[PDB]
């Protein structure tokens, strides 16, 4: 019937002034564009069919052609930026927004999907979809007493499209749009569907990836406890965005980091810092590095949760990127910590792995390690135990690495190693 048509036949059908022939040809086009192996999007565009599909979007008395054209345009907009642009240039944004309020659920869902693709292209088309007034009708679709009454796929698509409306930077989404979307996002963050939860966490992670004012917008809604609860979820697709959002939040002020701590986040990091997925370990160690850059009481809370041994472990054995995050965490710890906290760090066995890491080729990690060692030596100076620390570093074989770095290409490493050897060795 409408299977395996040529673009020539599709064009002939769509060009006829017979609405049923147009509908059949549009369905054939939808089936072509819905094929997994190289859908012929460029051929459909060159045939000039986008304006016809956009016009069909407005055929209220023929809902099937509305649906078929919306599906075809969705799949066109799912491609490159040029193909999404071809869809936008045909006037599809206002037509899809008008279809959001369709009495046919599948047509409204298809419009949500298409707008999601368009907005996911980037910040420009995101803001253009916002300017055409999509947020109000999108959120009106979720204005139900209980989200469980909605179809699962419909709700997942709405959540994903909203996440795309929260996505991308330079510029970030308009402040008023974020404020308009956030309450529904909190409500969705309390939903029970794993995919809805994952996409809501991704939206929150987007919204928290920015200056402290954006983070504050998010945290004032009271979402941090729910984010911590989701951080301890079993589904990796949920933990990943939740951990990203928590890390973004702790990149902010000390009070926002403290809101993360008060919600019980640290208690999850024994598992996160040993998680078998390298990405989780890296993100969690980065989050820890940003928590150790906070106040001394926050470093103390890190200590009380028994997380210093886990940082020692990550420093001893992990993917190099995770080890570099751990080096940063140790340097921040030593920069902001008390003398007691630093000697505790040393008692947990940090010196040996911190020195073994000096054999790396990256210069930044070497400089970070040297700064951490300088801070540790300063604490020892205040305790009059610099000779014991020097003996410890010498037994580990770190003095050899430092005297070798004295011949390093970078100026900072050269000077720091020479200063260490002249002041303590």
């Amino acid at each position: 019937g409408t299977v395996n048509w040529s673009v020539e036949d599709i064009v002939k059908g769509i060009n006829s002034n017979n609405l049923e022939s147009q509908l059949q040809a549009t369905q054939a086009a939808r089936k072509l564009l819905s094929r997994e192996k190289q859908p012929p999007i460029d051929n459909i565009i060159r045939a000039g069919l986008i304006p016809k599909f956009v016009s069909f979007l407005g055929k209220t008395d023929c809902s099937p052609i509305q649906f078929e054209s919306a599906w075809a345009l969705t799949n066109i907009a799912s491609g490159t930026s040029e193909q999404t642009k071809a869809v936008v240039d045909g006037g599809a944004i206002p037509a899809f927004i008008s279809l959001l309020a369709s009495p046919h659920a599948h047509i409204s869902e298809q419009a949500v999907w298409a707008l999601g693709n368009i907005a996911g292209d980037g910040s420009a088309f995101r803001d253009l979809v916002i300017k055409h007034g999509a947020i109000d009708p999108l959120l009106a679709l979720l204005a139900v007493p209980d989200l469980s009454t909605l179809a699962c796929g419909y709700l997942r698509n709405l959540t994903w499209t909203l996440s795309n409306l929260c996505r991308n930077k330079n510029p970030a989404p308009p402040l008023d749009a974020v404020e308009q979307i956030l309450p529904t996002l909190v409500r969705l963050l309390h939903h029970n569907d794993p995919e809805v939860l994952a996409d809501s966490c991704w939206a929150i992670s987007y919204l928290t990836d920015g200056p402290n004012e954006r983070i504050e917008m998010v945290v004032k809604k009271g979402v941090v406890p729910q984010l911590v609860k989701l951080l301890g979820a079993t589904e990796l697709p949920i933990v990943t965005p939740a951990l990203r959002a928590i890390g973004n939040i702790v990149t902010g002020t000390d009070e926002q980091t403290q809101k993360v701590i008060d919600a019980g986040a640290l208690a999850v990091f024994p598992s996160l810092l040993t998680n078998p997925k390298t990405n989780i370990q890296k993100e969690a160690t980065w989050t820890m590095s940003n928590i150790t850059a906070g106040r001394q009481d926050q470093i103390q809370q890190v200590v009380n949760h028994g997380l210093v041994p886990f940082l020692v472990g990550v420093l001893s054995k992990a993917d190099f990127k995770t080890q570099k995050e751990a080096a940063w965490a140790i340097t921040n710890y030593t920069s902001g910590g008390t003398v007691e906290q630093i000697v505790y760090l040393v008692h947990c066995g940090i010196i040996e792995p911190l020195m073994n890491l000096l054999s790396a080729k990256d210069t930044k990690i070497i400089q970070v390690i040297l700064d951490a060692i300088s801070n540790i030596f300063q604490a020892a100076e205040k305790l009059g135990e610099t000779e014991k620390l020097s003996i410890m570093i010498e037994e580990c074989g770190g003095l050899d690495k430092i005297e070798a770095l004295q011949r390093h290409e970078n100026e900072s490493v050269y000077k720091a190693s020479l200063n260490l050897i002249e002041k303590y060795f």
């Binding site: 859908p39 799912s78 999907w113 693709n117 990149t251």
Partner: peptide
Amino acid sequence: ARKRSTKKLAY
């Protein structure tokens, strides 16, 4: 001690 900071086809 300083802080350090898609599309879908319908088949």
